[PDB]
Design an enzyme around this catalytic site. Sequence first.
Site, mmCIF file in Angstrom:
data_model
loop_
_atom_site.group_PDB
_atom_site.id
_atom_site.type_symbol
_atom_site.label_atom_id
_atom_site.label_comp_id
_atom_site.label_asym_id
_atom_site.label_seq_id
_atom_site.Cartn_x
_atom_site.Cartn_y
_atom_site.Cartn_z
ATOM 1 N N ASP A 169 4.107 0.909 8.312
ATOM 2 C CA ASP A 169 4.432 -0.301 8.007
ATOM 3 C C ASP A 169 3.503 -1.307 8.768
ATOM 4 O O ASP A 169 3.955 -2.314 9.017
ATOM 5 C CB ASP A 169 5.896 -0.713 8.482
ATOM 6 C CG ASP A 169 6.369 -0.107 9.987
ATOM 7 O OD1 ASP A 169 5.516 0.299 10.472
ATOM 8 O OD2 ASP A 169 7.496 -0.163 10.130
ATOM 9 N N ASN B 147 0.125 7.135 2.825
ATOM 10 C CA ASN B 147 0.767 6.018 3.894
ATOM 11 C C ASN B 147 2.295 6.485 4.131
ATOM 12 O O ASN B 147 2.795 5.671 4.847
ATOM 13 C CB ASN B 147 0.540 4.815 3.347
ATOM 14 C CG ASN B 147 -0.824 4.207 3.306
ATOM 15 O OD1 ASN B 147 -1.708 4.689 4.087
ATOM 16 N ND2 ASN B 147 -1.221 3.511 2.096
ATOM 17 N N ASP C 259 0.839 -1.416 0.036
ATOM 18 C CA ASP C 259 0.019 0.069 -0.012
ATOM 19 C C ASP C 259 0.858 1.293 -0.144
ATOM 20 O O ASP C 259 0.536 2.166 0.741
ATOM 21 C CB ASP C 259 -0.968 0.129 1.290
ATOM 22 C CG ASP C 259 -2.320 0.905 0.912
ATOM 23 O OD1 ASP C 259 -2.507 1.425 -0.193
ATOM 24 O OD2 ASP C 259 -2.989 0.957 1.903
HETATM 25 C C1 8DW Z 1 -0.249 6.398 8.039
HETATM 26 O O1 8DW Z 1 0.080 6.529 9.657
HETATM 27 C C2 8DW Z 1 -0.408 5.242 10.273
HETATM 28 C C3 8DW Z 1 -1.278 4.488 9.661
HETATM 29 C C4 8DW Z 1 -1.375 3.086 10.671
HETATM 30 C C5 8DW Z 1 -0.913 3.101 11.665
HETATM 31 O O2 8DW Z 1 -1.429 1.983 12.611
HETATM 32 S S1 8DW Z 1 -0.005 1.358 13.273
HETATM 33 O O3 8DW Z 1 0.380 1.845 14.404
HETATM 34 O O4 8DW Z 1 -0.324 -0.197 13.440
HETATM 35 F F1 8DW Z 1 1.254 1.082 12.224
HETATM 36 C C6 8DW Z 1 -0.046 4.084 12.246
HETATM 37 C C7 8DW Z 1 0.147 5.220 11.598
HETATM 38 C C8 8DW Z 1 1.100 6.417 12.241
HETATM 39 C C9 8DW Z 1 2.284 6.043 13.087
HETATM 40 N N1 8DW Z 1 2.728 7.187 13.509
HETATM 41 C C10 8DW Z 1 1.924 8.199 12.869
HETATM 42 N N2 8DW Z 1 2.107 9.523 13.199
HETATM 43 C C11 8DW Z 1 1.356 10.373 12.622
HETATM 44 C C12 8DW Z 1 0.154 10.162 11.973
HETATM 45 C C13 8DW Z 1 -0.905 11.251 11.165
HETATM 46 C C14 8DW Z 1 -1.335 11.078 9.873
HETATM 47 N N3 8DW Z 1 -2.176 11.840 9.523
HETATM 48 C C15 8DW Z 1 -2.369 13.033 10.160
HETATM 49 C C16 8DW Z 1 -2.057 13.121 11.588
HETATM 50 C C17 8DW Z 1 -2.574 14.262 12.370
HETATM 51 O O5 8DW Z 1 -3.787 14.351 12.584
HETATM 52 N N4 8DW Z 1 -1.892 15.163 12.965
HETATM 53 C C18 8DW Z 1 -0.329 15.459 12.649
HETATM 54 C C19 8DW Z 1 -2.382 16.284 13.699
HETATM 55 C C20 8DW Z 1 -1.162 12.171 12.159
HETATM 56 C C21 8DW Z 1 -0.045 9.020 11.687
HETATM 57 C C22 8DW Z 1 0.968 7.663 12.263
#
Ligand code: 8DW
Lengths: 264, 267
Positions: free
Chosen positions: A145, A132, A127
């Site tokens: 990941d 992502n 993906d």
């Molecule tokens: C795409 O990010 C992730 C997708 C799945 C996920 O599950 S996991 O723990 O099993 F891997 C975790 C993430 C993720 C890991 N670290 C992250 N840090 C930030 C974000 C994030 C993505 N998009 C928007 C925000 C947000 O709302 N702010 C920064 C305010 C935050 C998203 C993540």
Amino acid sequence: YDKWEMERTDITMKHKLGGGQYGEVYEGVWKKYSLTVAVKTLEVEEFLKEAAVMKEIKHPNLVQLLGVCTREPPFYIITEFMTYGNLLDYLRECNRQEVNAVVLLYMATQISSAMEYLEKKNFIHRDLAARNCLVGENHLVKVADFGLSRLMTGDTYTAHAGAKFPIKWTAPESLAYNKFSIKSDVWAFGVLLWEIATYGMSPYPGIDLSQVYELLEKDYRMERPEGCPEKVYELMRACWQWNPSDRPSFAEIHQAFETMFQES
Amino acid sequence: YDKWEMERTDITMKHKLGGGQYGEVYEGVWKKYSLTVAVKTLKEMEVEEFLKEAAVMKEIKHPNLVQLLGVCTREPPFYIITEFMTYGNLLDYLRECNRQEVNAVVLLYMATQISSAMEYLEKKNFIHRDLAARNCLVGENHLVKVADFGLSRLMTGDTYTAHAGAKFPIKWTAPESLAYNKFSIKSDVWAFGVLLWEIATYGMSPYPGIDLSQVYELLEKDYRMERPEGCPEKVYELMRACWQWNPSDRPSFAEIHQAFETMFQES
Ligand SMILES: COc1ccc(OS(=O)(=O)F)cc1-c1c[nH]c2ncc(-c3cncc(C(=O)N(C)C)c3)cc12
Ligand SMILES: COc1ccc(OS(=O)(=O)F)cc1-c1c[nH]c2ncc(-c3cncc(C(=O)N(C)C)c3)cc12
């Protein structure tokens, strides 16, 4: 595995991040370190399998696992928090004077480094897309990941029957036969390069999804984005070779981007 | 790979340098030549940026810019190997020197050398972005070289916009950099002016006692540091020229170097 286990109470859960686009993923706080983290919660065996894979992953441009709650439900997967959110929103909202051509090269180089690592460890991502990828301080980029698959025997991984894919990022052989490989990841990487080059435009804009496969079959490819260097577009086109064996490896891709980044 | 790649085993590491102020930088020995060298290593700065800094240093060749000797980039831990400057950084050097030896003529000599390096960067389309006495190094007989890890490629006259949230060394930083994160060879000229002030005061801290949060406001109202005691009026005029509000009003490093060469020669 046991070293990864944490008590659920170590974490204060906050709001779901990314507007809910990633499902049950929340911003949270690890109280002990006052550390902001990302927490995915709970499909059980798949969930545990994915946590198990994340335990084996160690790379500067892959989201780092911090902890896990797999003793009793609700299940938790705890990872580092990337302060600048996902790469798609980041590109769409950035100052392009700051995030200029050299920075776009930098992002591509980092992502291709992560994918070269996965390529060597016999994993596939399945993906790869800007949504992502995540952004940290100083233009640091990491690939999310959860969902990696390990190749136990061959080069090709067959998805579950009836699985649905993001059509515009998905290689033709994956669309046609549900077969994924590091080469279909390379195809997706090509689309991701286009996302980067356009500062987050939607691929194949205005094109009917039902026509995408045939268009690709009859050699339609996205045109070079405005301002995209010809060498980068060449790499993009290489990633989109119809035959997977004709696509470059991530080692080759990373070497090329590294060279361009360093000369910039 | 290229002529620059060397085996890690060519080098024996000693202790960390500069009290750690420059991070993971070590004194080492290039065993083959019995040569003391400086070695920067990577423990955990992003890798690609580190490798790029090495790549840029390969292109740098000037008597007053630290000379790259070799690189270890095949496999971790990565190394950047450069010449070792016996007397350490210029700030501590100025603070600790015998001023009868490091006298007015030597200060002119130092400024001339530094401005020669910056004239070279200006010609070659690089910017430094952290010019200060702490980032200049001293060898025997008052030889001065500018530290060149961290150089950026930038067509002379263009502007680099620093990443959001970046923190700067405020007292060396040009007003357009402070306000808008904009850097250019002209912001390097501004910093050079502050470095001139450091040299003239033998390493005093600039804007003494002034609240950092007010420095920008002061600069807006045309406040500038006063002429240091014993500083020649011509040198102070050059300093003040470096601190013109509008970057385009600041002199080029070619002009600055010509002025210092003339003054040094007339000494
Ligand atoms: C795409 O990010 C992730 C997708 C799945 C996920 O599950 S996991 O723990 O099993 F891997 C975790 C993430 C993720 C890991 N670290 C992250 N840090 C930030 C974000 C994030 C993505 N998009 C928007 C925000 C947000 O709302 N702010 C920064 C305010 C935050 C998203 C993540
Ligand atoms: C500013 O000095 C450096 C900063 C970074 C760096 O990494 S690299 O990629 O360019 F190799 C190298 C240096 C550096 C290159 N040559 C050098 N020679 C001397 C010193 C130095 C600075 N401050 C204190 C000392 C010292 O402790 N002694 C001389 C005892 C030594 C520091 C350096």
